[PDB]
Amino acid sequence: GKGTPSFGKRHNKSHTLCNRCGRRSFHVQKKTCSSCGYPAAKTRSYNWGAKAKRRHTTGTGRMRYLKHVSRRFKNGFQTGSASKASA
Amino acid sequence: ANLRTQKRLAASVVGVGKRKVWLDPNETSEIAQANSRNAIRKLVKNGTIVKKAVTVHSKSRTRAHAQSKREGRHSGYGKRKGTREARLPSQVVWIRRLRVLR
Amino acid sequence: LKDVVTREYTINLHKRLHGVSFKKRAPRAVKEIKKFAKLHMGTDDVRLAPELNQAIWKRGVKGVEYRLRLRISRKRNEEEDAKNPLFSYVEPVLVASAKGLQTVVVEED
Amino acid sequence: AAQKSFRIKQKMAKAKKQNRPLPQWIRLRTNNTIRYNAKRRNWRRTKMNI
RNA sequence: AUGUACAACGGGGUAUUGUAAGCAGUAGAGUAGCCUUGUUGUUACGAUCUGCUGAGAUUAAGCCUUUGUUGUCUGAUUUGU
RNA sequence: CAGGUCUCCAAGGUGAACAGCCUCUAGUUGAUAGAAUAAUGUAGAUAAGGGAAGUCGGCAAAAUAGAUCCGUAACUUCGGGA
RNA sequence: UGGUAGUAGCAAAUAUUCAAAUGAGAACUUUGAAGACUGAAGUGGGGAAAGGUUCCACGUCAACAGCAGUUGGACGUGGGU
RNA sequence: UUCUGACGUGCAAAUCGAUCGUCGAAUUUGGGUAUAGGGGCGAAAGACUAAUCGAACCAUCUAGUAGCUGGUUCCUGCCGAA
RNA sequence: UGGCGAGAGACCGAUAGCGAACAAGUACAGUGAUGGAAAGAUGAAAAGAACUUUGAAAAGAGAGUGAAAAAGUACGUGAAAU
Numbered sequence: 001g002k003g004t005p006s007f008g009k010r011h012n013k014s015h016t017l018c019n020r021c022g023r024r025s026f027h028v029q030k031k032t033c034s035s036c037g038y039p040a041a042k043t044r045s046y047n048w049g050a051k052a053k054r055r056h057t058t059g060t061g062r063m064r065y066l067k068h069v070s071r072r073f074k075n076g077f078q079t080g081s082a083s084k085a086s087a
Numbered sequence: 088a089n090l091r092t093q094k095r096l097a098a099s100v101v102g103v104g105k106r107k108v109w110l111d112p113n114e115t116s117e118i119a120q121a122n123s124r125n126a127i128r129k130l131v132k133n134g135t136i137v138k139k140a141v142t143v144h145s146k147s148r149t150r151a152h153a154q155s156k157r158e159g160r161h162s163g164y165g166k167r168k169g170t171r172e173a174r175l176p177s178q179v180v181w182i183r184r185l186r187v188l189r
Numbered sequence: 190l191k192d193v194v195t196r197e198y199t200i201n202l203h204k205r206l207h208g209v210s211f212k213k214r215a216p217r218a219v220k221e222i223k224k225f226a227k228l229h230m231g232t233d234d235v236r237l238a239p240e241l242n243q244a245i246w247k248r249g250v251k252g253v254e255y256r257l258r259l260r261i262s263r264k265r266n267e268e269e270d271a272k273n274p275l276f277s278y279v280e281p282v283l284v285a286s287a288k289g290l291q292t293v294v295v296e297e298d
Numbered sequence: 299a300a301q302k303s304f305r306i307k308q309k310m311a312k313a314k315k316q317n318r319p320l321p322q323w324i325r326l327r328t329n330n331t332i333r334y335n336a337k338r339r340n341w342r343r344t345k346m347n348i
Numbered sequence: 349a350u351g352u353a354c355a356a357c358g359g360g361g362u363a364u365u366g367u368a369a370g371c372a373g374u375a376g377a378g379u380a381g382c383c384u385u386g387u388u389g390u391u392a393c394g395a396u397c398u399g400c401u402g403a404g405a406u407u408a409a410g411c412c413u414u415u416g417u418u419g420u421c422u423g424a425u426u427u428g429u
Numbered sequence: 430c431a432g433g434u435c436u437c438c439a440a441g442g443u444g445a446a447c448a449g450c451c452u453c454u455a456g457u458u459g460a461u462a463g464a465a466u467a468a469u470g471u472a473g474a475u476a477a478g479g480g481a482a483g484u485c486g487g488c489a490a491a492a493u494a495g496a497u498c499c500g501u502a503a504c505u506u507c508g509g510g511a
Numbered sequence: 512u513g514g515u516a517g518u519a520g521c522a523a524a525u526a527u528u529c530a531a532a533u534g535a536g537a538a539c540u541u542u543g544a545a546g547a548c549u550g551a552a553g554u555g556g557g558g559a560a561a562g563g564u565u566c567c568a569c570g571u572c573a574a575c576a577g578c579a580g581u582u583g584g585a586c587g588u589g590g591g592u
Numbered sequence: 593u594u595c596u597g598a599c600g601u602g603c604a605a606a607u608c609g610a611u612c613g614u615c616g617a618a619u620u621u622g623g624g625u626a627u628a629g630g631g632g633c634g635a636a637a638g639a640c641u642a643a644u645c646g647a648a649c650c651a652u653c654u655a656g657u658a659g660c661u662g663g664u665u666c667c668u669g670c671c672g673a674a
Numbered sequence: 675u676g677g678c679g680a681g682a683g684a685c686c687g688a689u690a691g692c693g694a695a696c697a698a699g700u701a702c703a704g705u706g707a708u709g710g711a712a713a714g715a716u717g718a719a720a721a722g723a724a725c726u727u728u729g730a731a732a733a734g735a736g737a738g739u740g741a742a743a744a745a746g747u748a749c750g751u752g753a754a755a756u
Contacts, residue, residue: 003605003643008433010642011560012623014705017305017348024348025706029625034706048652052708055699058677070678088533089541089582092568104455104555112543115532122568144453149442168495169445196418199357207409210466212526215546219528229356229419239544242529246546250526255406256357291358292418299561310563317564319587331696331714333747341563342575342584344702431523431603435559435622439551447552455555458548461521461578462538471522471598472609489595512756519601523608535730559622573732642705650707 021056088119093127097136100127107139192275195262195295199287200225203255211251218245218253226277230263234276244281256287260295306348313339313346 018026018033020043025035036056037044045053058066072078090110098105110118114135121130130136155161167174205221206214219237222245226235245253260280266273284290320335339346 001606003432004430005433005604005607007643010705011434012705013561014642027706035708046651048650049708050652051693051699051710052651054693055708060699066677073678091541094542106454106456110542112531112541115542118542142453144441146441152442164497165495166444167497168443170496173445174496194419198418201357201409203406204409208466216526216528225356231420237529239529239531243545246528249546250528289358291416292356294418299563300558302563307563314564336697336701336713339701340585341565345562347705432607434561437557439553439555450550452550454551455553456549457554458526458546459539459554460524489597512754523598523603650709 088115090115090118093118093121096124096127097131100124101131101136101138103138107141109137109139111135192263193265193297194230195260195297196229197282197290197293197295198225198229198259198261199256199290199292200259201256202253206253213250215245215250215253222259222279225259226261226279230261230275230277232263232273232275232277234266234271234273236276236278238278238280241279241281254287258282258284258287258290309346309348 014027014029015024015034016026016028017024018036018038020038021033021036023035026033026038032039035044043056045056094105094108094110097108097110101108117135118130121127127136152161200222202218202221206217209217219242222237222241223235227233241259244257248254258281260282262278262280263275264278266276316337317339318335319338320332324330324332
């Protein structure tokens with residue numbers, strides 16, 4: 001009775017999509033995510049989750065701005081525009 | 088051909104369910120062309136798909152038996168399986184005995 | 190060489206559908222009439238008829254009649270021919286009581 | 299389900315537009331190792347879990 | 349493989365149940381309808397009963413027997429001191 | 430995957446009945462088949478005479494059973510027991 | 512990757528049959544003719560949860576449907592709320 | 593409940609069949625919500641807490657430690673135990 | 675032992691080296707925290723097989739390209755079990 005006829009009754013969801021991390025770990029009754037910790041203002045990661053940081057650090061996504069930062073350091077944070085020389 | 092959709096459409100058009108339509112087996116190539124409901128309404132009108140009228144459930148032996156019960160027959164003790172206050176309750180008979188006198 | 194012979198028969202199904210399971214009798218009537226027409230006409234491609242199919246299944250699976258009048262026609266085949274050039278075609282005939290009738294060679298005119 | 303919010307249907311739209319084989323012209327392209335689509339999600343095999 | 353052969357039917361015997369379907373009946377508890385209202389007064393309804401009816405049905409699929417009717421009767425394979 | 434998962438509609442006959450059994454509207458005819466039908470199984474049966482003598486124990490089956498009428502003891506908390 | 516072994520087995524839910532069409536090929540597709548079943552606390556009509564395109568059409572038969580396949584909740588392409 | 597029937601490399605990591613308890617209330621149940629690990633909850637069986645429970649699952653400390661079990665990769669020669 | 679930009683090796687060479695030489699924190703499993711793969715090498719170059727025939731088709735047989743198809747897109751050499 002504790003096996004397949006009680007896996008019959010299993011037709012709800014305890015978790016839904018998290019808005020922040022999008023991973024489907026958002027607990028509905030507690031109203032807090034269990035993977036990223038939304039809506040607490042920090043992102044939960046722990047030093048025993050060595051692989052979890054490897055799944056959620058920088059560089060795993062687009063790097064929509066930092067990709068351009070180091071290059072913009074190399075030129076010395078230029079402002080303005082360049083001129084025309086020849087050819 | 089493969090006339091699944093034609094039998095479904097014919098049941099939806101005529102209104103009788105799928106167990107009673109009659110796509111005739113001689114004109115099957117014609118019914119291979121009629122793929123829309125507007126063509127099913129052509130093939131119902133001229134007589135290529137018909138309705139196959141209802142199987143008879145004669146309530147005639149029922150009428151003869153109820154007529155015999157009206158005559159007094161068929162009501163012994165071996166046709167009497169419920170209790171005397173379940174066939175006709177005593178409270179019903181009492182209300183009839185006393186809505187009349189009152 | 191011609192062999193277009195058409196005959197009639199009584200098939201006795203009680204001596205052939207004896208002791209069979211009830212939910213198998215009418216299909217065994219069918220498989221038995223095909224074996225009958227294989228025995229008599231000699232060809233091995235036998236076609237029954239939906240009239241004959243109704244005549245077996247008048248009484249469900251377990252009510253096939255005792256004697257039937259068959260009419261077996263050994264016609265010649267054509268049109269991308271099968272492995273024999275002749276086939277049987279087995280119709281029923283309408284009679285009141287099938288008991289008492291012998292076999293009859295049907296004349297074609 | 300049969301009466302939905304919008305966000306789940308938006309992800310179903312993405313899950314529809316991804317449920318297709320390779321374009322036939324990629325297999326001729328220079329330096330190609332992709333021989334099929336290794337992410338075909340069917341509905342009888344893998345539930346996407348929203 | 350051309351035979352007082354065999355098979356499919358049909359006939360007869362044997363056997364099992366038990367008197368069919370249909371038609372008829374001064375049989376039928378009674379119930380109405382009528383008229384010359386009767387000394388069986390009839391017509392209709394009426395489970396059942398009687399007569400043809402020890403009838404009908406089945407009978408070999410592991411029963412018997414048969415001069416009747418209709419048919420079938422060489423397809424394939426291997427084998428030697 | 431012969432399991433599990435909340436609810437609405439609701440036909441005719443027997444029958445007290447939404448029981449079982451048969452049909453109408455509706456839907457299926459899908460669950461590998463063919464031939465034989467040995468042992469031993471699974472599922473259902475039926476048995477002469479005796480009757481639990483079987484067995485740890487009447488375990489398993491059988492028997493009763495619906496309705497109508499009559500009749501209904503000890504004990505009792507006086508309601509029942511039935 | 513074996514022997515096991517082409518065996519154990521593919522047996523609950525009373526059940527299939529005939530002819531035609533497509534086709535290289537129909538026990539299983541389609542139509543028709545029968546025969547049955549669920550028998551309205553239904554193997555019927557709608558839904559909630561859940562699934563997410565499975566809905567619907569055209570084409571195809573490699574793989575899957577523990578047999579089959581010209582059929583499909585499959586495959587390919589589109590349409591649809 | 594019983595058959596201690598079926599099945600027991602199953603239809604099924606607990607179902608199938610007949611029998612049987614109860615069926616109007618300390619009833620059955622959907623959804624929401626509350627209670628969480630040495631804590632929750634318990635008409636109490638140490639039962640239940642997502643096939644896990646005399647103390648859940650996950651990761652880390654962690655390659656825990658073991659006087660205990662298993663294994664320990666080529667040849668020839670010289671000596672050789674307890 | 676983080677990020678960026680560099681140089682190197684008495685290191686590993688695809689069951690090794692990071693979990694990841696490839697669409698690798700990917701496919702997938704779990705309610706979740708999390709767990710987490712496998713998978714490189716035709717040829718110099720697609721020249722990746724026109725054409726005829728058998729078959730319904732897959733394919734075969736010839737033919738042909740290629741140094742070589744005992745390299746044919748299930749593609750380098752291609753062992754042992756079997």
